[PDB]
Ligand binder design. Structure first.
Ligand SMILES: O=c1ccn([C@@H]2O[C@H](COP(=O)(O)OP(=O)(O)O)[C@@H](O)[C@H]2O)c(=O)[nH]1
Length: 427
């Protein structure tokens, strides 16, 4: 039994992965404590974990959980259709600047919470380094909740966030890595100054320090990047971090499931549906599909309507819906992607940005779904892909087998043994 201290970035994609892993570790009678802003306190307490509040005076205690990222996606909607290269400068770097802003707000509050809680182990799900964790003198694990391609970074291996593969021309890979290094210079220069001020040595190129203890990620064995070598050094693969139960209301009348017809979950994640004009175009196409859609309509749900073959709400109980659908249309977010495979569902992937491009490429390359650019996909492409995947028995059988493998995985038992050994070695 041990006290495990979880520090997630203040967004669904990080918090849900950490809740998933916390529930799995609670099974072994470990006590999991979360450091989050007040608005995230009751949502996490609904899973019966203890919360330590971090102050963020830039966000109200009672702000809607979807407001912070919804307003971001709304403000940057014009970048969501651009090439991965154009997105890097215009969207991903601005996105990382928001991660750095939050890291600077929480970092000064973590050392006192560590002294007061005295955890055995820290688990962080963050895209940038926390000096408070590096300098804690306690064992800490970095949790990757995004697609894991960046953990494989090195010679010959394509960089993440561009949908590239082992088959990409070396010239293109080299060009992308040079572009990323040039593009990140000023952000890294400013970030490193902050690290040095707190007595932390910067990384040569990254602004997120890999744990010298262990680095855990969430990706099915069947999908992992074995073509780029084994599980990377100091890394540990869990097949999934699915929270099996979700406390949220369904979000609409359950009687919808009594309507005859194949059921499709349409969800661009916790923030992507804040691109209202995109949601309107896609819903217009899906309105012509002779199936039934359940739609995660997002922060601006009140600004657009669904046609008669569809039901939707601001935010859905996605765990309750997934076992009742035949197909998922999503943005390639890593939680939604692994949740859909966990329940044996094929997927249509419509990547918006970042690691989603890699999950779109992975769905095509592993023949478990179809991927298109959401702002470009034609009515014919989208309607035909839906009928294709619903009717492809071989592909449905492959996705069922991946779900079986994910559910059969014992890797949580090995993970628990490794963390117990890590705590003993450093005592
Ligand atoms: O209506 C919704 C929309 C999203 N989610 C959850 O929000 C998380 C979104 O994380 P993901 O990595 O899929 O996408 P992100 O929103 O982080 O890009 C997933 O766990 C979903 O199950 C949900 O419960 N209901």
């Amino acid at each position: 039994f041990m006290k495990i201290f979880f520090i997630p970035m203040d967004a669904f994609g990080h918090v849900n992965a950490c809740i998933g892993l916390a529930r799995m570790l609670s099974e072994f009678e470990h006590q999991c404590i979360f450091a989050v802003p007040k608005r995230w306190c009751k949502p996490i307490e609904e899973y019966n974990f203890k919360v330590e509040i971090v102050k963020d005076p830039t966000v109200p205690d009672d702000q809607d959980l979807q407001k912070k990222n919804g307003d971001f996606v709304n403000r940057y909607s014009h970048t969501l259709s651009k090439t991965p290269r154009e997105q890097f400068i215009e969207l991903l770097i601005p996105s990382i600047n928001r991660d750095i802003h939050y890291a600077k707000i929480i970092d000064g509050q973590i050392p006192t919470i560590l002294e007061s809680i005295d955890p055995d182990l820290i688990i962080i799900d963050f895209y940038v380094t926390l000096p408070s964790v590096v300098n804690s003198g306690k064992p800490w694990i970095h949790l990757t909740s995004c697609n894991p391609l960046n953990l494989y970074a090195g010679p010959n291996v394509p960089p993440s966030c561009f949908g590239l593969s082992i088959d990409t021309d070396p010239d293109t890979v080299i060009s992308y890595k040079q572009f990323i290094a040039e593009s990140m210079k000023d952000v890294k220069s400013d970030f490193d100054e902050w690290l040095v001020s707190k007595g932390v040595k910067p990384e040569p190129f990254a602004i997120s320090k890999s744990s010298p203890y262990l680095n855990v990620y969430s990706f099915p064995s069947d999908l992992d990047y074995s073509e780029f070598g084994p599980v990377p050094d100091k890394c540990f693969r869990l097949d999934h971090m699915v929270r099996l139960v979700q406390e949220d209301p369904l979000g609409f009348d359950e009687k919808f499931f009594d309507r005859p017809g194949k059921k499709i979950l349409f969800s661009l994640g916790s923030m992507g549906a804040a691109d209202v004009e995109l949601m309107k175009r896609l819903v217009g196409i899906l309105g012509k599909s002779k199936h039934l859609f359940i739609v995660s309509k997002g922060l601006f749900h009140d600004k657009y309507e669904l046609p008669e073959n569809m039901i939707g709400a601001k935010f859905l109980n996605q765990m309750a819906i997934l076992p009742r659908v035949d197909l998922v249309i999503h943005h390639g977010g890593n939680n939604t992607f692994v949740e859909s495979l966990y329940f044996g569902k094929p997927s249509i992937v419509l990547p918006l940005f970042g690691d989603q491009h890699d999950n779109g490429r992975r769905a095509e390359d592993k023949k478990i779904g179809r991927s298109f650019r959401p702002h470009h996909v034609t009515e014919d492409e989208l309607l035909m892909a839906i009928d294709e995947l619903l009717n492809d028995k071989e592909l449905n059988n492959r996705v069922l087998k991946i779900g079986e493998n994910i559910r059969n995985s014992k890797s949580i038992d090995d993970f628990n043994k490794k963390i117990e050994e890590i705590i003993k070695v450093h005592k």
